[PDB]
Amino acid sequence: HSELLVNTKSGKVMGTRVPVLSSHISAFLGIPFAEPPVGNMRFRRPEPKKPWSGVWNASTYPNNCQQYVDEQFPGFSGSEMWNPNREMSEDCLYLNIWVPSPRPKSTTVMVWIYGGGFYSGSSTLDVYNGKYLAYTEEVVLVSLSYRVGAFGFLALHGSQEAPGNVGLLDQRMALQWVHDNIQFFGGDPKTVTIFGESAGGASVGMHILSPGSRDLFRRAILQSGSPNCPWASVSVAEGRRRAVELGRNLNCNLNSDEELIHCLREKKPQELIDVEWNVLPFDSIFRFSFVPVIDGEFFPTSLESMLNSGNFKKTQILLGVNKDEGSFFLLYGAPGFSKDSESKISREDFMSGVKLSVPHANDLGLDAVTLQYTDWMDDNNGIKNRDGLDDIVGDHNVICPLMHFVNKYTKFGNGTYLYFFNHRASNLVWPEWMGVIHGYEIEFVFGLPLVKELNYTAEEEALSRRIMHYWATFAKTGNPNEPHSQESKWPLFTTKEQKFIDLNTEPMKVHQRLRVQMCVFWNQFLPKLLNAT
Amino acid sequence: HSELLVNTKSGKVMGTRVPVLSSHISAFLGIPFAEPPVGNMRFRRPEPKKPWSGVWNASTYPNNCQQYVDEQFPGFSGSEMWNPNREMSEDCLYLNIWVPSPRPKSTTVMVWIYGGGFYSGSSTLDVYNGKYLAYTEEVVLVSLSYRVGAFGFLALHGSQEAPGNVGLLDQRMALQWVHDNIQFFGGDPKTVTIFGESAGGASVGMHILSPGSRDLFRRAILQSGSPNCPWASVSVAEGRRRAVELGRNLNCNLNSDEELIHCLREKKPQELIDVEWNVLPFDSIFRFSFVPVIDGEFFPTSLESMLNSGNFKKTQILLGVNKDEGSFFLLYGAPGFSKDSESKISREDFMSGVKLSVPHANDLGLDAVTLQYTDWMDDNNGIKNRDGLDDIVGDHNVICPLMHFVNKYTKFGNGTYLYFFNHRASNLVWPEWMGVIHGYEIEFVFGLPLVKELNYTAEEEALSRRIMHYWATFAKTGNPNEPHSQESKWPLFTTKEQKFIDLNTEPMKVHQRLRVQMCVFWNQFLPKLLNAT
Ligand SMILES: C=CC[N+](C)(C)c1ccc(CCC(=O)CCc2ccc([N+](C)(C)CC=C)cc2)cc1
Ligand SMILES: C=CC[N+](C)(C)c1ccc(CCC(=O)CCc2ccc([N+](C)(C)CC=C)cc2)cc1
Ligand SMILES: *[C@@H]1O[C@H](CO)[C@@H](O)[C@H](O)[C@H]1NC(C)=O
Ligand SMILES: *[C@@H]1O[C@H](CO)[C@@H](O)[C@H](O)[C@H]1NC(C)=O
Ligand SMILES: *[C@@H]1O[C@H](CO)[C@@H](O)[C@H](O)[C@H]1NC(C)=O
Ligand SMILES: *[C@@H]1O[C@H](CO)[C@@H](O)[C@H](O)[C@H]1NC(C)=O
Ligand SMILES: *[C@H]1O[C@H](CO)[C@@H](O)[C@H](O)[C@H]1NC(C)=O
Ligand SMILES: *[C@H]1O[C@H](CO)[C@@H](O)[C@H](O)[C@H]1NC(C)=O
Structure with a gap:
């Protein structure tokens, strides 16, 4: 159809129409936004995608970037729903777009940046399926891809062959292409909201902070993740240590910074993935090997200063945290925690x-x-x-750092909305001692409770729509609240009172100073x- | 009468009979136990009292030792009930005895050691009147006197003319005389209990610790005071500093340690009392200038070691703490506290x-x-x-230090009973924000609620007798509880469970681990x- 044919400044793209609930919307899958980072492009900054000729078949899903695969509970849905579901490859720099039908004139754009400790991720997971949100809210949803693990964060500071934050750029580049072309899919470029969770939420905040990214988006949403999390960055120094320590495990020639890179450049991807975790410098839960480096190029100064002087994009943001953040990490790394046990x-x-x-x-x-x-x-x-x-x-790694980011931010920001999610899905497959788990508000934001077959309760489907609206309304208003709606208002967060709200199946209540006593200790x-x- | 004439190894003593409630008991007031520490005896160890001839008129009260007089709320009962009520003098080394009538054969003896920051005190205060306890419980009550302030604690370590802890000896000496003569007043020497509050409670514990005192008493009771309180001792060094700093204010010759003493020996008592507080080394609430020194003679080693190795008298003890300890000190020393105000x-x-x-x-x-x-x-x-x-x-200066003393003690002790007093007298004259004040369980122990004219409620008079029995029963049993009585039992404190009890007008409840979280912080x-x- 014509609905399914679009002309972008890069080339022509042929999508596919997909069913969604009662209706039908169109989707463009796996459009490339950069030249594949394979060969000796490995470790280097992304390169714009040389326009193609003819039509591109954006009907099927793209490959997933190389990464560590969680094999802890083989077959367990709970664990595998996050594992890559498409052939992994170093050529994985694509993006996906869910467009309403008929194609809008120019409407609110929402960009999803997935995340998983900066070592895993994937835009193709079924939990990140745009159709429900795109359709239920009349919105152009786009999820992007970026290089994780050593492939996207190995940092030998001086070298141009392997500077860090590289995977952070794949992001910017996707962000660039969206800005330059989303208007042809009927999306309004002057109104794009980037929202991500966990490492994605931290990335979102790192673009609010970074000069080169700042101009490419309108507003932001961070879910269980601020950019100043203890686990989200390292000095160019520590980055370099881990760079060579990696080479050391792979029998590389640690003599010359150029040679180190060459060696690492000749190893099968999975070989790097095998020793990936042997570089951490201490026994610990919630720390990842290759992560963004505070280089001075992507980040002018230490994040603390930037936060401190207002050196950042001042727009309005909506962020939140989940009731039991630490739960998931203990299970996977602390002694004494077991899945099939009371623990x-x-x-x-x-x-x-x-x-x-x-x-x-x-x-x-x-x-x-x-x-x-x-x-x-x-x-x-x-x-x-x-x-x-x-x-x-939880407090140490997610909540308290975010609260800090929130206070220093709203001191210059143009609006701040804060939620505290604490509803435990009726059908969670994880054990109860885990409670409201990390990353489990995602399925609600993307509207899965809306499909019968997933056996979600009725008040749960209610809450999903409630969330999905807050999220979309914010995205194109800079306020979650309906201009007049006869509902209770999601109050703005002020450094005075600092109210936030409860997200769950029952009637919203607003509270004050989220975990303040515990956070003064940490912060x-x-x-x-x-x-x- | 004969009841009123007693023959002690020191000399003959003529007492007086005094009314008590409905009956009449006999009392011997102001019997000397040491040669008056006047002249150049000033600062020196006590000297035994050379036997006198003829009969001594123990019918009137003795003088009170020199000391700072609280003039903060002139006329206010609340404050003046603690001020000395008899002519002050350096000749103040006497003791008082309330004996039942008829004279017992040989019964339980209770020695009261008053206390007030080691700078004030007095055995003559009406709140320390033995008759009610002596009579209500059939017990020989004796309260002693000791040198406070510089007069009893100035410590120039090397010198024999002014070693410290001197006032601690006046105590031992009284304790000696009681042991050697209380049998003539019908008291059982093998069963004397020494009980004191505040600085008195700390003194009690310092005799449990000290070798030279150890043998002179049976059991002990400490009220709002352990010997290891932060405010109850100092190094021989700090003691020396404050010794000379005192001389410095009084224009003394700080050249020779012998001369310093001479100078201080020639000043009118009250002159020393005037500069007494100018020696503290820092602005602070709850610290006193002249206090016991850890010399190596009275105390073999640091109190912590002694506590730690079991180097102390192992008998059974009963100690306690009041609900609002810090209250009184803030009022007198912190900015913002006022008596006639909500504060x-x-x-x-x-x-x-x-x-x-x-x-x-x-x-x-x-x-x-x-x-x-x-x-x-x-x-x-x-x-x-x-x-x-x-x-x-409160926690820092009274509760937590006592809890420490209690744990380290019961690890070797032959019994430990712990109370938590928290009843606020119906007629307290102090403001409510002060609550269950420091030193206000004293009037209950000494049985004042038993006299109508003091307007105490009925359940209060009930509680006073309840206390007074616990206290006396313990004193001659080493257990507060009645051999069979159909009442709830005051459980023993164990390092396991560590139970203690509530002392107040309603039915006793036993609790566990008194202020444990707060005390781990302090301790x-x-x-x-x-x-x-
Ligand atoms: C759950 C939320 C879903 N989303 C948000 C996508 C998500 C968020 C965050 C993460 C990172 C999880 C971990 O890094 C801790 C667990 C962990 C600890 C140790 C190890 N090994 C040492 C390598 C093996 C030990 C078994 C592996 C994993 C993944 C997925
Ligand atoms: C109340 C309980 C009764 N008993 C147990 C006998 C008792 C217990 C404890 C004390 C000591 C009280 C103080 O040391 C603090 C109050 C204080 C603070 C500062 C000062 N100046 C600086 C010298 C003057 C300032 C105004 C004087 C007193 C007395 C009596
Ligand atoms: C947000 O920005 C607008 C336009 O600059 C301004 O009028 C408004 O007062 C700001 N509100 C906040 C949340 O500071
Ligand atoms: C109920 O919902 C679960 C969760 O998705 C689904 O897997 C299951 O098939 C449904 N019914 C069954 C077979 O238990
Ligand atoms: C107290 O001492 C007696 C006699 O030495 C002993 O029989 C008893 O077990 C001890 N009890 C405690 C409280 O340790
Ligand atoms: C009530 O008791 C108080 C407290 O001792 C006493 O001073 C007073 O005289 C009694 N009655 C009066 C006059 O208020
Ligand atoms: C091109 O995309 C894939 C090829 O893998 C397949 O669905 C089909 O052959 C083409 N798409 C459509 C529906 O034209
Ligand atoms: C001796 O003691 C005092 C003297 O101050 C006085 O009560 C009386 O004269 C004598 N005591 C008695 C009652 O014999």
């Missing part, structure tokens, strides 16, 4: 647990941390030690203590 | 408050302290900042933090 923790594994969580802390620091989360009226409670550990991981006390040592 | 505290006086309370703490330490007692969900609450400050003073964390700095 009560000994006061002896709780100690081991704590060490893994604050790996950069000395004794005194660890005590502080314990004195903090330990209940002493009953200090050997299996559950209390388990749940208390979940809070340590102020602990740091000052480890500093004096 | 809500600014987040700005609260900071000043905290500094005064932990005077030996650096920044980091102060933050720790604040991070600890501050409520951040509402961090500028007048009441919360006021009450939170009361807990800091373990804070110390380790200020240590690493």
Whole structure:
């Protein structure tokens, strides 16, 4: 059809129409936005995609970037729904677009940036299927791809052959192409919102911060992730260490910075993936090997200064956090946590647990941390030690850093909306001790509760639409709230009162100062203590 | 009468009979136990009292030792009930005895050691009147006197003319005389219990610790005071500093340690009392100038070691703490507290408050302290900042140190009973924000609620007898509980469960781990933090 044929400045693109609920919308899958980072392009900045001729078959899904595959619970849906579902390849720099039907004139664009510790990811996962959101909200949804792991973050600072943040650029480039072409799919370029979760949420905030990205989007949404998370960046120095340490495992020639790169450039992708985790510098839960580097090019200065002087894009943002963030990481990395078990923790594994969580802390620091989360009226409670550990991981790595980002931001920002998601899906396949898990508000945002066959309750399908509207309304207004709607208002977050809201099946309530006592400890006390040592 | 004539190894003593409630008991007032520490005896160890001839008129009260007089609220009963009520004099080394009638055969003896920061005190105060306890419980009650302030604690370590702890000896000496003569008043020497409150409670524990005192008594009771309180001792060094600094204010000749003493020996007592507080080394609430010194003679080693190795008298003890300990000190020394006022505290006086309370703490330490007692969900609450400050003073100076003493003690002790007093007298004249004040369980122990004219409620008179029995039964059993009585039992404190009880007008409840979270901070964390700095 004509609906299915579009002309972009890059070339002509033929999509496909796909069913969605009762109607039918059109989708363009796997349009390339950069020259494939294969060969000796490996490790280098993305290169714009030389226009093609003839029509491109954007009817099928693209390959997924090389990465670590979670084989911890083979067959378990809970775990595999995040594993790549398409042939992996180094040629994976494509993007996907879900367009309403009929094609809009020019409407709100939403760009999804997936994330998984910067070592995994994938735009093709079924949980990230645009059709429900695109259709239910009349919106042009586009999800992009980017290089994860060593392929996108290995950083030998001085070299032009392997500077870091490279995978952060694949992002910008996709962001560039969208800006330059989304108008042909009926999307309004002056109104694109980029929203990502976890490492994606941190990436979103890193583009709000970075000069070269700043101009390419309108607003932002960060879900369980701010750019200043302890796990989201490293010095060009640490980056270099891990760069060579990787070479060292792969029997590379660590003599010349040029040779190191050559060697790493000749290894089968999966060989790099095999030793990927052997470079971490300490035993710890929630830290990844290849991550963004604070280089001075993508980031002018340390993130703290930028945050501090207002050196960032000032627009309006909507961000949030989930009830049980740390849950997922403990299960995968702490001793004592088991999937098929209640997982009560000994006061002896709780100690081991704590060490893994604050790996950069000395004794005194660890005590502080314990004195903090330990209940002493009953200090050997299996559950209390388990749940208390979940809070340590969560607060330290996701909540508290975001709260910091939120305060320093709203001091210059043009609007700040904050949610606290805490509804546990009726059909979650993970065990209860895990609660409202990390990354599990995603399925609600993308509207899966809307399909019968996934057995979601009725008030859950209600909440999904409630979320999906907040999210889309914000995206094209800079406010979640309906201009007049007879509903309760999602109040703006102020440094005065600082209200936020509960996202769940029952009637919204607004609260104040989310985890303030616990976060002053993380954001102020602990740091000052480890500093004096 | 004959009842009123007693023959002690020191000489003959003629007492007086005094009315008590419905009956009449006999009392021997102001019997000397040492040669008056006047002249150049000033500062020196006590000297045994050379036997006199003829009969001694123990019918009237003795003089009170020289000391600072609280003139803060002239006329206010609340404050003056503690001020000396008899002519002060350097000749004040006497003791008093309330004996039942008829004279017992040989019954339980109870020795009261008063206390007031080691700078004030007095055995003659009406709140320390033995008759009610002596009579209601059939017990020989004796209260002693001892040298306070510089007169009893000035310590120039090397010198024999002014070693410290001197006032601690006046105590031992009284304790000696009781042991050697109480049998003639019908008291059983093999069963004397020494009980004191505040500085008196700390003194009691210092005799449990000291070798030379150990043998002179049976059991002990400490009320709001352990011997290891931060305010109860100093190094021979600090003692010496304050010794000379005192001389310095009084224009003494700080040249020779012998001359310093001579000078101080020629000043009118009250002149020493005038500059007494100018020697403290820092602005702070709850610290006194002349206090026991850890010399190596009275105390073999640091109290911590002694506590640690079991180097102490192992008998059974009964100790306790009051609900609002810090209350009284803030009122008198912190900025923002007023007697005739509600006393809500600014987040700005609260900071000043905290500094005064932990005077030996650096920044980091102060933050720790604040991070600890501050409520951040509402961090500028007048009441919360006021009450939170009361807990800091209390925990740090009375509760937590006692809990430490209690744990290390019961690990070798032959019985440990712990109470938590929290009843606010119906007729207290102090303001409510003060709550269950420091030193206000005394009037209950000494049975004042038993006299009508003092307008105490009926359940209060009930509680006073309840206390007075616990106290006396313990004193001659080593257990508060009645051999069979159909009442709830005051459980023993174990390092396992560690139960204690509530003392108040309603039915006793037993609880566990008194202020454990707050005390681990004081007893373990804070110390380790200020240590690493
Ligand atoms: C769950 C949310 C879904 N989304 C948001 C996409 C998501 C978010 C975040 C992550 C990263 C998970 C981890 O890095 C911790 C778990 C982990 C720990 C250790 C290890 N090995 C040491 C390599 C093997 C040990 C078994 C592997 C994984 C993935 C997916
Ligand atoms: C109340 C309980 C009764 N008993 C147990 C007998 C008792 C217990 C404890 C004390 C000591 C009280 C103080 O040391 C703090 C109050 C204080 C602070 C500062 C000052 N100046 C600086 C010298 C003058 C300032 C105004 C004087 C007193 C007394 C009596
Ligand atoms: C947001 O920006 C607009 C336009 O610059 C301004 O009128 C408004 O007051 C700002 N509001 C906030 C949230 O600061
Ligand atoms: C109920 O929903 C689950 C979750 O998607 C689905 O896998 C299942 O097939 C449905 N019914 C069954 C067979 O339990
Ligand atoms: C107290 O001492 C007695 C006699 O030495 C002993 O029989 C008893 O077991 C001890 N009890 C405690 C409280 O340790
Ligand atoms: C009530 O008791 C108080 C407290 O001792 C006493 O001073 C007073 O005289 C009694 N009655 C009066 C006059 O208020
Ligand atoms: C081209 O795309 C794929 C080839 O893999 C396939 O669906 C079909 O042959 C073409 N698409 C359509 C529907 O024209
Ligand atoms: C001796 O003691 C005092 C003297 O101050 C006085 O009560 C009386 O004269 C004598 N005591 C008695 C009652 O014999």
